[PDB]
Every structure is written in C-alpha cells, then in structure tokens.
Structure 1
Amino acid sequence: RPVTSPGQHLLAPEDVVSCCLDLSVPSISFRINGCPVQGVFEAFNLDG
C-alpha cells in the first residue's frame, strides 16, 4: 500500500529508517531520514 513521504524513494544507500512500536494502541510507525511516514499499522493482534 503506497505511503507518502518527503523525497519519496525506494530504500537507497545512506537511508535511515526509524521504526517505532507502541503496544498500547497498538501502533507501528516509521520515519525516513528523520522525516515522517504518512502511514501507520494499528489494531493488530498481540498474541505473541
């Protein structure tokens, strides 16, 4: 599913991906090179 980010490009050299997990919501979020990624995973199973 496409997600919008500044300087949107496929993972390239020197790229930095920051992954954040909150288990309360639950929610998973990303940042690219310090820039927000305008999409999130949420409401997923917490069985494991």
Structure 2
Amino acid sequence: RPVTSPGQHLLAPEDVVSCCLDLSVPSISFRINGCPVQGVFEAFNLDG
C-alpha cells in the first residue's frame, strides 16, 4: 500500500528507518531519515 513520505524512494544507502511499536493502541509507526511516514498499522492481533 503506497505511503507518503518526504523524498519518497525505495530504501537506499545512508537511509535510517525508525520503527516504533505501541502495544496499547496497538499501532506500528515509521520514520524515514527523521521524517514521518504518513501511514500506520493498527488494530492488529496480540496473540503472541
């Protein structure tokens, strides 16, 4: 599913992906090179 970020590009060298997981919501969020990723996973199963 396409997601909008500043300077969209397929993962390249000198790129940092920050992954955040909040189990309360639940939600998974991303930031690319310090820039927000305009998309989130949420409402997923917590069976493990």
Query: Which TM-score band (shorter chain)?
Result: over 0.9
Q: Which runs of 5+ in 2 are unaligned?
A: none
In the aligned structure 2, how far is the partner of 1:4 from the partner of 1:46?
27
Task: Supply the RMSD in Å over aligned alpha carbons.
Answer: 0.1
Q: Sequence identity, in percent?
A: 100
**Per-residue deviation, 1:29:** 0.1
Q: Which runs of 5+ in 1 are unaligned?
A: none
Question: TM-score with structure 2 length normalisation?
Answer: 1.00
Question: TM-score with structure 1 length normalisation?
Answer: 1.00
The number of aligned residues is 48
